[PDB]
């Protein structure tokens, strides 16, 4: 009954208000606010989207996102992107490349309100791709010069590693990964090392000791037990088969 509508598809597209677009053009923030204030309901009442044509939903709320200088706004459209990732799950697909470099670079907003609705965003969008497809953005992201993307960028992927298929990595992808995290565990920065670790201590955890521990031959002896460290509480919450 009330709980199976929740699985009926809705048609939010044809619910935004008329003038969605316009507001968000608006230079009096608190005009933006209220088209996002209206779409954020309708994402929370709504948790099953029908499919349609969301191209110009997604490039408003980037736009949002990398360009607006009000961070509640940021917030704002970082949390409605990952209700709509969510929403229509792998029907988000073909938006989700465009997306993540941008997501990603905008780590380099410490407010933390920002950084959970940027996380949130960035993991819901990840569920509808591959660290695979999303390989070059990840790896050029590790490689910023901002140390708060660095370290956002690593625990990306220890996130995501939780819930990935061990058979969705191949030998190259394990290498270059690996590699790419070492390089910024030796990061002079704390936070960057400490995410590393994390990221690196995942990665063990999903694709096993014998696999991974080739790659880290070089690992001093202080960073490998960071790094088994964040392996032992690791928690892959995905079933290989």
């Known amino acids: 009954g009330s709980h199976m509508d929740l699985l009926d598809p809705v048609d939010i597209l ?3 208000p008329k003038d969605f677009y316009d507001k968000l053009e608006e230079k009096k923030w608190t005009l933006r606010k209220e088209s996002l204030e209206v779409l954020e309901k309708l994402l929370t009442d709504h948790p099953k989207l029908e499919n349609g044509e969301y191209g110009a939903l997604v490039s408003a709320l980037k736009k949002v996102i990398t360009k607006d200088s009000n961070v509640v706004l940021v917030a704002m459209a970082g ?3 990952a209700l709509l990732a969510k929403g229509l799950a792998k029907r988000f697909s073909n938006y989700a490349s465009a997306c993540v470099p941008s997501l990603l670079e905008k780590f380099k907003e410490k407010k933390p309100n920002v950084v959970t609705a940027l996380r949130e965003a960035i ?11 999303q390989q070059e953005s990840i790896v ?3 490689s910023n010069k901002n ?6 960028t690593a625990l990306f992927i220890a996130r995501a590693l939780t819930r ?3 058979t969705a990595l191949n030998k190259k992808l394990l290498k270059l990964l690996t590699t790419s995290l070492v390089k910024t565990l030796n990061e002079p920065d704390p936070t960057v090392r400490d995410s590393s670790a994390e990221a690196l201590g995942t990665l063990i955890k999903l694709m096993g000791d014998k696999a991974v521990t080739p790659l880290l031959a070089d690992v001093d002896p202080l960073k490998m037990a960071k790094i088994k460290e964040c392996q032992e509480k690791a928690e892959i919450k995905i079933k290989v088969a």
Do not use: N
Not at 123 to 133: F, M, V
Not at 147 to 152: A, F, G, T
């Open 123 to 133: 993991d819901a969008i990840y569920a509808s791709t591959s660290l695979e497809a």
């Open 147 to 152: 140390p708060s993307v660095k370290s956002e």
């Open 14 to 16: 044809s619910k935004m």
């Open 164 to 166: 990935t298929q061990p």
């Open 79 to 81: 949390k409605c992107l």
């Open 140 to 142: 050029e992201s590790l």
